Every structure is written in C-alpha cells, then in structure tokens.
C-alpha cells in the first residue's frame, strides 16, 4: 500500500512512492514546498529554482531538513528518511553526491551555484535525518591506495593564489555547514582568545577578527585589502585548508587518523607547511581540536609578528599609476616572474640590488618551477626590478617566427602576487625570535614521535622528523626567511597529489601539475568542485567517486611511448613505435625531396629496401608527368608495397591538379599509402577535404613554428580516428627551413601533442646514424633540459641519403656533398650569415 505523490516545477517532474500510513504529512509538505518554490520560467535559467529533477528532490530534502529538529522527534523524520532513500536509489547509484554534481555540470545546463545548493541540501538532509557517514566510502582512489596501486601525497598551498581567498571559506561554511560548522566556530573562538591573551593584537586587528559575523552577513565582511593582510589571511588560509581536509575525511567516513595513514607523505608551500605538520599529528576527532589549535596558533603568531616586522605602507600614487598603465599588477611585496631561468632572474636582482641599500634589497623567495620564480622585497624595490625587466622583455604581441632563434628577444610575463607581506625574505628575520617565544608561551611544540607520516621541508626537501632542533622553529625559519624550492621538496614518488590549498584551479595543485607533467602524477584539486575540459588534473569528485572515473592515472610518457622490439614469424626484428605499428615497416622514413625523391627509381629502390619514402610532387608540372612517374614506381615495387606523395604548399598551382590526381589514383586503388604536405600546414577546411575525400591511410604534416604545431593539433582533434604524422624538423634541416630550434618547440608542445593519440610524432633534421637518433627514440634526449623523457615515434633522413647509390645526384655533386664537413647543432644558425660547414642560407625562388 503506497499512494504516489507528484512534485513538479513546470516541464520537469518527479514522483515519490509515499506509503499510505504517512501520506497525510507528505501532502502538506508537498503543498508548502510548492508554495515556497517560485513560478517556473523557460530554460529554468532563473535562480533559486531547480534545472533538473535531481535538484528539485535536493531542494525538497533541504526544505524538509530545515523544519525537522535533530534532537526532538517530530512527525517529519519518516518523510525525510523516505525521500533521502528514494533520492539515493534513483540518482546516486551507490556513487557519492559530488560524482552526480560533476555529472550534472558536464551534461545538463545546471550552474555551479545550483549544484553546490544541491550538495548542501543532500548533506544537510543526511545529518538532520540521524544518518551520519559511519560506513567507509568505497572510493576508487582510496581502495587503490589500500591495495598499493596508488600513493597519495597531500600538498597545502599558501598566499598569492587568489586575492578573494575568503570566498573559499564562505563556500565551506555555506555548503558543508553541518560538517565544518563546529571546526570554524572552534577556530574563531581560539583566534578571539589569542587576541585577548597576546599583549598588543587589537592594534594589528583594526576591524577585529569576528570571522563568524563576516560569514553570516556578507555586508559586515571587511574589504579585500584588510582581509588579505597577513594577521588575518594566515590563520584563515589555515582554517580553509583544515576545513577542506575535514570535509574530505567526513565524506570518506574516515577520522583524521585513517585519512592521514592513507597518505605516503604531506608537504606545503609557505604557511601551507604549518597545516601539513598539524595533519600528520592527527589521530581521532576528539584529539583533532589540539592538532588544529596548534596550526591556528602558529599561523596567528607568524601573521602577527611578520606584520609588526614589515607593515605595508602607502605607495606613491605615481608608481601605482605607472604599474596600471603598463598592464602590470598593483605593487605588492612579492613579484612572480614566469618564463625566465633562475640564473637570468638572479642576474636582474643582482643588478637591482647593487644600487639599493641592505634594508631595501630584493631576493628570490620561491623557486616554483624551472622558469617560474617569485621575488620578495619592499614593493618599491620590486617596482624598481619591474622597470629593469620591462626594458628587457619584448612586446607580448610581437611575432618572431621569421627571426633566427638566437637573435629572438626573450619573452616573459611578470605580475605582482596578491599578498600583503614579503614572505621568505630578510625583512621578516626580526620576527623569528619573537615567534619562537609566543609558541613556548602557548605550549605549541611539534614533536617527531607524534608525526606518523613524513612531512617534507620546503627548503632542502628532507623530512622534518629527522631534525635535531625544534620542528616549530625550523618551519617558522622555512616560512619567514628561507626560500621555497618547490621542485626540490616535491621529488617524492607518488601517483596522486591532493591540493587541499586555497586557489582551486589557480592554486598550488595546478602549478605542481605543470612542474611534473608526463611523469605519470595525477594532481587532484581537493577543495574546488568544477569540470576540467582537458581532464589533465582532477577535482573534488575524483576523491569520492567509487567507479573507474575515481582512479584516473596521468600518462607517463616514458612508459606510454617506450620503444619496444617485436619480430614476425619470419624472425625479422622491428623497432615497435606508434608509427611502425601502423605501417608494419621500421619507423625511418625518407621524406619527399626535390629533386632527390622525384626519381621513380630511387623511390622504388627505397620501397624495395622495406622503408617508407615520399615521391616529391615538386619535380612535376602536370598530372600526366606525375601519373607517368607513379605508374613507373608501381611497375618497379613488389605487390603489396606502397609509397607516399609529398606536395609543397608554397606551390598552390600544383595542388589544384595534384590533389584531384591523388583522389583519382586512390579511387582506381593505386598503392599511395599517404600524402605529406611540406612548406606550410593546411587550414582546418582543406585538411578535412584531404582527410576524407582522398582515402589515404594517414596524412603527413611538417609544421615549421609553434603556431603551425598548434594548427596540426587542431587538424588531429577535428578527426580523432584518422592518423596524422606530425613530421617535426628544426631550422637545421636541408632545403626550405624554419628559424626554429629543433628542441625548444618540442619541449613546449610535446605534452599537448601526446593528448591526441592519433598524432604519430616523427623527429627529423640533422640525423645520420642510430647513435644520434637513439636519445630521441628512448626519450632520454629531453633529460639534458631537466624535462622528463619524451620518446618519439619515428625519424626522417633527408640530407643523409642524398649520396646513396640509387639517387640520381651527379657523381661530382655527391663528391661536393661528401666534402661539406658540416657543423654541430649549436652552430647551425651561422648559415644565415656566412658559409658554415660548406652550407649557407639563401632566399629561394
């Protein structure tokens, strides 16, 4: 016996099978809910109204859960439990709420605020219905950690990620009130007690620190400039990180102990490190309020004493006006300089610091990447630096594609971080001695034995458990004055990294992802629910998800593209790469060369050797002349053999007979395996005609510049099932050439290229033997630039095969070619000026 209740919002509907015993109460609740629900609109784009049935059921859960009291037993207990159980069974197929929240964003038109409202309501419901998170979630990632197929490390961010950090604390107080309401009230009480206890704290906290009043009423929340000042921003960034931790612990059904013991290790960036050591002390929910109280008390005293040591003073209006007119930030005590090496930046700061006195000197403070540094000093000094830099940088929109690589003006961004104090600088040193007394007055000491997981120092990367001195004093020293070598500390082996830190997509996680792309390390942003389009780093949902979509491993290029050996039944050994696997021949090609491969006898002789070669269209001026060439190639090769055709693009009058020719010859079934276009990457449209109209196996493209590589990646993505053969040659190549270095563009673009499995990446230019190509096959070539290994699928030899027997090149020309000494890659660009190893660059026809 069950009378169904029909609950609606315009077009979208849901049906609840309410038992006949309690339907009286459910009909009242249905009426009241439908009265509160606003009048439906088209699309549902209007706020406070559901977009999907799942949201509506959420809003109902939320509405009921508001009325029910968690202590007193009302009549609404049974209707709440029944609509929860019905919502679970219908929408959360065993999976976690965040998995459904994610699914709605990437499928439906649901906005992010409506999703967060749903999650709030579902969690609120679950807690008010006396249904806590007792049972351990079956999270894929945490299952895989128990088994041993995943190693989790927890990283905690710091300052300089976002200017609007407090909204992250507002979103936690709103969305997860019933989980972290008790934490935030405890932290706000501890802070309020420290203000009174500390002799002169009211002086540094001008507008008070009543964080609860600022959470309830966004009208009483002070301006961003006050909030950002370190005596607030330090403890509150702690609170946000600990809250994201608790939320993660509660939704997984773990106590902080269990969640800590599932981590191989933890570390932090700046004041993050204070959290990471407090996390490592955690055992059970009863003893978590001492581990938080430590981390709040430390972050409070750091933030107070470091402000008393170098308080931010009014900047001259002229300086602020200049900075805004040059598209730079608002001068702060920390400046981020992207796309310059650490030597280059240290050269500039050494020049700037030569003219400045001791108490105004800048210094490199964060080493975030190879080419990502943060300089910390007085904001004027850093404006000084910023002027020296704006002199040296090229214009941002300047095209240098036609300038030789060495003569190119170095390009680099530089913006001020949103931060109020100069962390990791000499300016905060006087604070040190004051902090190390405030910790021993409030009996705040981190002991080695109480830390159960290794926590990595930000300076040298060594564990903090194996120190002789105080860990609290060493952490303070690591935050206030000692620099942060992020690459050095994150040298730990781990498949998964959880960015608890503030900043979401602009936080420490995404930075750490960029640092160790292609090593097979998945970063998961554990604080922010969102949809990644590229899906290269995870969000909140991946931690909770119970399906295969919970455990996503990032590609390790050395493993995904490791070159192997294989053999036929005939016992012939092949080098097995993405490229050779398609064509069933060694991954060595002779590219279309005018006039070396215009000869049908050379094309046939190379094909007969079992090696792929392009017939150069450049040596033909008519469909008949090129038909007679192809006919001659086909008469000289064994049955089943194939070759390809190279067409120049800087010769557009050839393509208008050559492309229709290939189309006609493929329609008669001529053994043309593939077409390569030299001297320019076609547009998306013409490339799409070449792909489907020509009936080739694969398309070859020879990008010249980064912009051209990007164009090839676009053509690949448009047709994800068609194999594209991205033939990359540097400017060091024979014949028409680019201005580009052979390595640099591959370092930038290799990651992006491997995101498209249909691209078969072939390296050309400057190759003669197996000795010089082996590093590119293995991928070890890219270790010399401190990148991870980046294996290549195959190789092309142009200049090398010009003196072969079967090449029509005249004996005296072959003697002239053999005479040319040639030069190493470092000295290739001299061909633009003078004869260099018997070679020179000229402007062609």
């Amino acid at each position: 016996s069950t009378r169904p209740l029909t609950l609606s919002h315009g077009s979208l509907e849901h049906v609840l099978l309410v038992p006949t015993a309690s339907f009286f109460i459910a009909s009242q609740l249905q009426e009241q809910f439908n009265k509160i629900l606003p009048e439906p609109t088209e699309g549902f784009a209007a706020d406070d109204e559901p977009t999907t049935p799942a949201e509506l059921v959420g809003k109902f859960l939320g509405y009921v859960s508001s009325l029910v009291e968690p202590s007193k037993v009302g009549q609404f207990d049974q209707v709440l439990n029944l609509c929860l159980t019905e919502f679970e069974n219908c929408y959360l197929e065993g999976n976690d709420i965040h998995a459904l929240a994610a699914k709605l964003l990437q499928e439906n038109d649901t906005t992010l605020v409506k999703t967060k409202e749903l999650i709030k309501n579902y969690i609120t419901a679950r807690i008010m219905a006396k249904r806590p998170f007792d049972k351990k979630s079956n999270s894929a990632l945490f299952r895989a950690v128990g088994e041993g197929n995943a190693q989790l490390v927890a990283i905690f961010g710091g300052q300089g990620n976002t200017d609007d950090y407090f909204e992250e604390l507002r979103d936690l107080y709103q969305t997860y009130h019933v989980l972290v309401g008790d934490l935030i009230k405890f932290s706000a009480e501890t802070l309020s007690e420290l203000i009174r206890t500390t002799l002169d704290a009211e002086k540094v906290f001008t507008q008070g620190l009543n964080i609860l009043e600022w959470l309830e009423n966004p009208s009483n929340t002070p301006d961003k400039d006050y909030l950002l000042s370190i005596p607030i921003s330090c403890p509150l960034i702690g609170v946000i990180q600990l809250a994201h931790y608790v939320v993660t612990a509660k939704l997984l059904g773990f106590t902080p102990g269990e969640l800590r013991s599932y981590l191989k290790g933890a570390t932090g960036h700046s004041q993050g490190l204070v959290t990471a050591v407090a996390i490592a002390e955690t055992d059970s929910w009863e003893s978590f309020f001492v581990s938080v109280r430590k981390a709040i008390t430390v972050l409070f005293f750091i933030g107070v004493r470091c402000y008393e040591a170098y308080p931010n003073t009014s900047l001259p209006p002229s300086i602020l006006e200049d900075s805004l007119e040059n598209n730079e930030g608002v001068p702060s005590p920390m400046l981020s300089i992207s796309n310059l090496t650490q030597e280059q930046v240290q050269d500039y700061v050494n020049k700037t610091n030569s003219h400045l006195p001791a108490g105004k000197q800048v210094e490199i403070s964060l080493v975030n990447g190879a080419k990502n540094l943060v300089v910390s000093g007085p904001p004027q000094s850093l404006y000084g630096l910023n002027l020296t830099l704006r002199k040296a940088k090229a214009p941002s929109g300047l095209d240098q594609s036609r300038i030789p690589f060495s003569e190119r003006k170095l390009k680099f961004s530089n913006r001020f971080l949103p931060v109020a104090s100069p962390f990791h600088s000499h300016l905060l040193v006087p604070a040190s001695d004051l902090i190390n007394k405030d910790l021993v007055k409030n009996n705040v000491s981190f002991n080695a034995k109480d830390i159960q997981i290794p926590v990595y120092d930000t300076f040298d990367g060594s564990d903090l458990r194996v120190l002789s001195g105080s860990i609290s004093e060493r952490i303070v020293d690591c935050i206030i004055r000692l620099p942060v070598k992020w690459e050095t500390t994150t040298q730990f082996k781990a498949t998964h990294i959880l960015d608890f830190g503030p900043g979401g997509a602009s936080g420490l996680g995404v930075l750490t992802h960029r640092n160790k792309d292609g090593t097979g390390v998945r970063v998961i942003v554990a604080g922010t629910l969102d949809i990644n389009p590229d899906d290269d780093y995870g969000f909140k949902q991946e931690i909770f998800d119970v399906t295969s979509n919970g455990l996503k491993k990032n590609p390790n290029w050395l493993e995904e593209y490791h070159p192997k050996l294989i053999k036929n039944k005939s016992g012939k050994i092949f080098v097995e790469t993405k490229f050779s696997k398609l064509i069933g021949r060694p991954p060595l090609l002779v590219p279309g060369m005018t006039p070396c491969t215009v000869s049908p006898d050379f094309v046939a002789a190379t094909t007969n050797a079992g090696y792929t070669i392009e017939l150069a269209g450049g040596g033909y001026f008519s469909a008949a002349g090129m038909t007679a060439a192809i006919d001659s190639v086909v008469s000289q090769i064994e049955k089943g053999s194939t070759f390809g055709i190279n067409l120049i693009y800087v010769n557009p009058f050839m393509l208008q007979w050559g492309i229709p020719l290939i189309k006609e010859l493929r329609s008669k079934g001529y053994p043309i395996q593939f077409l390569t276009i030299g001297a320019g990457v076609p547009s998306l449209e013409v490339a799409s005609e070449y792909i489907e109209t020509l009936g080739l196996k694969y398309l070859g493209l020879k990008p010249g510049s980064i912009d051209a590589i990007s164009q090839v990646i676009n053509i690949a993505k448009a047709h994800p099932n068609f194999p594209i053969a991205l033939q990359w040659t540097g400017g060091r190549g024979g014949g028409h050439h680019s201005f580009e270095d052979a390595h640099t563009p591959m370092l930038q673009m290799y990651s992006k290229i491997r995101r498209h499995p249909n691209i078969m990446l072939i390296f050309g230019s400057g190759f003669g033997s197996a000795d010089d190509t082996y590093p590119y096959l293995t991928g070890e070539w890219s270790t010399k630039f401190d990148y991870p290994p980046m294996p290549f699928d195959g190789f092309l030899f142009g200049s090398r095969v010009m003196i072969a027997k079967e090449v029509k090149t005249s004996p005296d020309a072959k003697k002239c070619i053999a005479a040319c000494t040639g030069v190493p890659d470092d000295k290739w660009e001299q061909t633009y000026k003078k004869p260099t190893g018997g070679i020179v660059t000229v402007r062609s026809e």
Binding site: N568, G584, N758, D771, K814
Partner: protein, 132 residues
C-alpha cells in the same frame, strides 16, 4: 654524417634500424633475442588503441567496430587480418577488404566460429535466413 659516397639506400637505412635494434636489445632485453615478443605479422595497428567455439548474433543496434574485433579475436593471425585489415591487394592495386563488406553486421546474421584457438583449424561460418 654524409661521408661515404654511393652507399646503397638499403645499407644506410638497415644500418640505422639495426643500430637501434642492437641498442634497444642491450638496454631493455638483456642482449637476448629470445626475449623479443613474436607475432604472425607486424603492422595494421591504428594509433588510437580465449573461447574455442563462439557464436555472435548481429542486430540493428550492433556496433560495427566491436563486431569485427570480436570475429577477429585477440591473437594476430590470418583471421585477425581478414577482419581488421581495411584494404587487401589485387595484383598491385589496393581495394576495400571484401570479407569486411560481406560480414558487415545486419539483422538475422549469425557467425559460428569453431576451433577459434588453433588458427590453422579455425572455420568462421556466417549463416543468414534463406526462405525463413
């Protein structure tokens, strides 16, 4: 590296390929050719990505790619070629694989495979409705 004149193109390319093989063998196979995996034929694999007597009933919903992969089986042999090679060769020309055209999945089609493990003995038998 252009030094030896009138070296045959085969000798140049083999010399690179064999150089790679000899380095790869030393580094990743403890210099022992017996540890190199063997296949019937090496090729055909697009870069995108144990039952003796099976049966397969096509429908109108049947996915063409999963259909063929199923008929072909896991082992690389004459069947795998027959069902996944997109092109075959008539003398020197290259024409659409006629086996794939013929097995193209449609309602009523029923593929019995027998001795699907021993590639020498494997018989694939397509049966369709003919007068009911």
């Amino acid at each position: 590296f252009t030094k030896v004149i009138d070296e045959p193109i085969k000798s140049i390319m083999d010399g690179i390929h064999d150089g790679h093989i000899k380095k790869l063998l030393h580094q990743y196979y403890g210099d022992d050719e017996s540890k190199i995996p063997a296949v019937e034929y090496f090729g055909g694999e697009s870069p995108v990505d144990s039952e003796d007597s099976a049966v397969f009933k096509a429908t109108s919903s049947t996915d063409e790619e999963s259909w063929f992969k199923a008929l072909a089986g896991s082992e690389i042999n004459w069947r795998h070629a027959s069902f996944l090679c997109s092109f075959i060769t008539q003398d020197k020309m290259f024409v659409s694989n006629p086996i794939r055209k013929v097995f193209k999945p449609s309602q009523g089609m029923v593929v019995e495979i027998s001795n699907g493990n021993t590639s020498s003995k494997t018989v694939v038998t397509l049966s369709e409705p003919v007068q009911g």
